[PDB]
UniProtKB/Swiss-Prot annotation:
Residues with PTM Phosphoserine: S303
GO molecular function terms attached to this record: FAD binding; glutathione-dependent sulfide quinone oxidoreductase activity; quinone binding; sulfide:quinone oxidoreductase activity
EC assignment: 1.8.5.8
GO CC list: mitochondrial inner membrane; mitochondrion
SUPFAM superfamilies assigned: FAD/NAD(P)-binding domain
Protein name stated in the entry: Sulfide:quinone oxidoreductase, mitochondrial
Length: 413
């Protein structure tokens, strides 16, 4: 049975970042990544891809080109987790043991929970920014929009980047004004949630936009059926159960229902809902002390964002180092996360907050305003930071940046 001191499950944002950091602690030959996909994507780009502002090719690189040098890429899927015996099963019929385990399997998309998807994507006028197979269909549907309803959904499940389903709406509405079709478009946001955003400061700002641009937002409305050939969508009224509505669309962006990865749902490392059961502050597993979790696959009570993964990687780096010296972890993860809310083709409301859902802004100015600077940062600077800093283990969030920015705001006050 092959053994690795540190075994990383998943070759995404959290997996590649943790493998880079652990490589410095224990050596590249003592680290392994279990990842099936041959491509690695910076998913935050797909919002602008579906809006036509960015190309899909720029968001992906071969998985081989982000594996840390010297670290073994176990190209396969995880099929079973047996933490009581510190081992893992693999769709190549291979068993792997570990001294420490880092689980970073992300979140799972389930378009099939909606009738009848994904078969409906074979037809025009419908897309989804959440899949590499459908993000370009969002842009094609936005280009070919003539007249009618432009409908954007938010499912009744946990999601990754909760702001993305409404980012493309603001971008679509700006495109309609840009190209002389706003008078023809009826923009509808049907969300299963009862609020536009989970933080008061940024939700109030997003509400100003919704009123100013005459966007229709129906809360507690969930998409249940797509009749793609008919170009109809069926929504259920979560507020009055039993009520359903069939509505035509000239453009339909679908945010799929999401769930923990299937291999984790009934796994011994999951909680009652299927997420990896980890400590809120240290990211160490609550049952098995040599198991750790990071990212969308965990039950960390904060937003599932790559920005949260960056902040979690720094905490988890310390947690495992302290555990490696038999000590007790002291640095607590604050639940930092950020959703770069694109409101136009050159504006971004940069929401940053913590576990208490209170703003934790990095910059001195008020980030609840739409800013060209925050757009230029997200579009033209974050991608470089992602490939070159974070995936190499040199980015643990903007905590140090926030402190030194506030120090200068004390030098001035
Ligand atoms: C459209 C969109 C826009 C977004 N915009 C932003 C943004 O502006 N800011 C932000 O902070 N976040 C954003 N996000 C969120 C961000 O992309 C994710 O939260 C981030 O990638 C989470 O990292 P992760 O490692 O936990 O998951 P991932 O990066 O998705 O990694 C999961 C990996 O696990 C692998 N895997 C799955 N199952 C198995 C298995 N059984 N065995 C082995 N490997 C497996 C997958 O192949 C994948 O490589 C956005 C997401 C989307 C979809
Ligand atoms: Cl760090």
């Amino acid at each position: 049975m092959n053994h690795y001191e540190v075994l990383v499950l998943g070759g995404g944002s959290g997996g590649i970042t943790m493998a880079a950091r652990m490589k410095r602690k224990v050596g590249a030959e003592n680290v392994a990544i279990v990842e099936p996909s041959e491509r690695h994507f910076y998913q935050p780009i797909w919002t602008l891809v579906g809006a036509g502002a960015k190309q899909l090719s720029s968001s992906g690189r071969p998985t081989a080109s982000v594996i840390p040098s010297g670290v073994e890429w176990i190209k396969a899927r995880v099929t079973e987790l047996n933490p009581d015996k510190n081992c893992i099963h693999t769709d190549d019929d291979e068993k792997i043991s570990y001294r420490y385990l880092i689980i970073a399997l992300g979140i799972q998309l389930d378009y099939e929970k909606i009738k009848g998807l994904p078969e409906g994507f074979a037809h025009p006028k419908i897309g989804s920014n959440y899949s590499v197979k459908t993000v370009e269909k969002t842009w094609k549907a936005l280009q070919d929009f003539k007249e009618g309803n432009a409908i954007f959904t938010f499912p009744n499940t946990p999601v990754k980047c909760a702001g993305a389903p409404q980012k493309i709406m603001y971008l679509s509405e700006a495109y309609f004004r840009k190209t002389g079709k706003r008078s023809k478009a009826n923009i509808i946001f049907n969300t299963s949630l009862g609020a536009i955003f989970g933080v008061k400061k940024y939700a109030d700002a997003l509400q100003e936009i919704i009123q100013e641009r005459n966007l229709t937002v129906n809360y507690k409305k969930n998409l249940i059926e797509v009749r793609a050939d008919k170009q109809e969508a069926v929504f259920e009224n979560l507020d009055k159960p039993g009520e359903t509505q069939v509505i035509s669309y000239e453009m339909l962006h679908v945010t799929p229902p999401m769930s923990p990865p299937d291999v984790l749902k009934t796994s011994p490392v999951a909680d009652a809902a299927g997420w990896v059961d980890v400590d809120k502050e240290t990211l160490q597993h609550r049952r098995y002390p040599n198991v750790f979790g990071i990212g969308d696959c965990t039950n960390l009570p904060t937003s599932k964002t790559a920005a949260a993964v960056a902040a979690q990687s720094g905490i988890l780096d310390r947690t495992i180092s302290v555990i490696m010296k038999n000590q007790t972890p002291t640095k607590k993860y604050d639940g930092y996360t950020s959703c770069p809310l694109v409101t136009g083709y050159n504006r971004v409301i940069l929401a940053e907050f913590d576990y208490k859902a209170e703003p934790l802004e990095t910059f001195p100015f008020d980030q609840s305003k739409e800013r060209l600077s925050m757009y230029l940062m997200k579009a033209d600077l974050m991608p470089f930071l992602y490939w070159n800093m974070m995936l190499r283990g040199y980015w643990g969030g903007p905590a140090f940046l926030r402190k030194l920015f506030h120090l200068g705001m004390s030098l001035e006050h």
